[PDB]
């Protein structure tokens, strides 16, 4: 039963198709890979074959498995009767899918089947809009593709020269481990305007507390705040590396400026600013099973006049996609 011999040399994949080759990961866009596969000869329980993803795509997308040993279960490959033909997992770090045959295969031959698995952007490795190679290995054979990411720009806000402007994206949600963490990137003033008396609010909900599982609080939330040297260098994908020299962490300058006084919201007092800041949120959600929905808000004035107030909000929520597959062999 345990993972045994690699039988890529016995498995041929075919009729490979992506569901689509262009989408917008900032509006829940994703694709699927679909392929047929067939086994030449016989395999035995524990034999396995693999598929390997390149830098531009991931199998997990905005779902985070770092608290589950970087491993995600995948849907079982099942026969018509419903019997499990292969169990499958995916390694987040090595981007490798492994399909391990069960004892169903022991008395069979010329097993063949098919799968459809959801594929997502890699926000870190594909940080800008554009076209990327997405050459995918299945069973030691390459299937070449191009994928185009047209990210909805994170640079959004009120249409005045001193207008409030802010955006965010939840780029990691831990659904597996039980810890219920989430990771959110917030871009404050991505327009890089000159703003007076700036306040930012990070909420664990949108309009209705009871309709989100998010919990923002001093004990559930940690914030890191970075001043951005060059705004042009920020991702379109909302990925932001805390170690990138373009970001200067200034968290220690905000110890008197962050308040969890109000319900399910953190407020941050930015004051008079003229740069973009990144806020990396490490949060948690509760066990109500409600959707995780959030909103960030920024308000400010015109610093030269003291007036021309404005306020802008930005909602986040994520969606889940599923895979499926089947296989049968002759006796």
């Amino acid at each position: 039963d345990a993972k045994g011999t690699n039988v890529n040399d016995k498995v041929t994949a075919s009729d490979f198709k992506l569901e689509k080759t262009a989408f917008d990961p900032n509006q829940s866009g994703n694709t699927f890979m679909a392929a047929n596969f067939k086994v030449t000869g016989q395999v035995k329980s524990g034999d396995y074959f693999t598929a390997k993803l390149p830098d531009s795509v991931t199998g997990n997308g905005d779902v985070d498995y770092s608290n589950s040993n970087n491993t995600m279960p995948i849907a079982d490959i099942k026969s018509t009767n419903g019997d499990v033909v292969a169990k499958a997992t995916y390694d987040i770090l090595t981007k490798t899918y492994t399909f391990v045959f069960t004892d169903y295969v022991n008395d069979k031959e010329n097993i063949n089947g098919q799968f459809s698995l959801p594929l997502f952007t890699d926000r870190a490795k594909a940080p800008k809009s554009g076209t990327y190679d997405a050459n995918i290995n299945i069973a030691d054979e390459m299937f070449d593709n191009k994928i185009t990411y047209n990210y909805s720009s994170p640079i959004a806000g009120i249409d005045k020269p001193n207008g409030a402007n802010i955006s965010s994206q939840i780029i990691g949600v831990d659904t597996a481990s039980g810890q219920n963490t989430y990771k959110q990137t917030v871009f404050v003033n991505p327009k890089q305007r000159v703003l007076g008396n700036t306040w930012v609010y990070i909420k664990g909900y949108q309009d209705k507390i009871e309709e989100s599982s998010g919990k923002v609080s001093a004990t559930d939330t940690k914030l890191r705040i970075f001043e951005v040297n060059d705004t042009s260098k920020l991702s379109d994908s909302y990925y932001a590396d805390p170690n990138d020299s373009n970001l200067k962490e200034v968290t220690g300058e905000f110890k008197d400026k962050i308040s969890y006084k109000y319900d399910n919201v953190a407020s941050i007092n930015f004051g008079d600013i003229n740069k973009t800041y990144v806020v990396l949120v490490e949060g948690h959600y509760d066990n109500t099973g409600k959707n995780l929905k959030t909103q960030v808000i920024q308000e400010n004035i015109d610093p030269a006049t003291g007036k021309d107030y404005s306020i802008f909000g930005w909602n986040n929520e994520n969606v889940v996609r599923y895979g499926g597959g089947s296989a049968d062999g002759d006796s």
């Binding site: 990961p25 900032n26 509006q27 829940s28 866009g29 994703n30 199998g59 997990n60 997308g61 905005d62 779902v63 995600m72 279960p73 995948i74 849907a75 997992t89 995916y90 698995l117 959801p118 997502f120 909805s152 994170p154 955006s167 965010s168 994206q169 939840i170 780029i171 949600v173 659904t175 597996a176 909302y238 909103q295 909000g313 930005w314 909602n315 986040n316 929520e317 994520n318 969606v319 889940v320 996609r321 599923y322 895979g323 499926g324």
Partner: peptide, 13 residues
Amino acid sequence: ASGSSGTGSTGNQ
């Protein structure tokens, strides 16, 4: 819905 939205897979769990 407004703002932006993400997407991922839980591996059918």
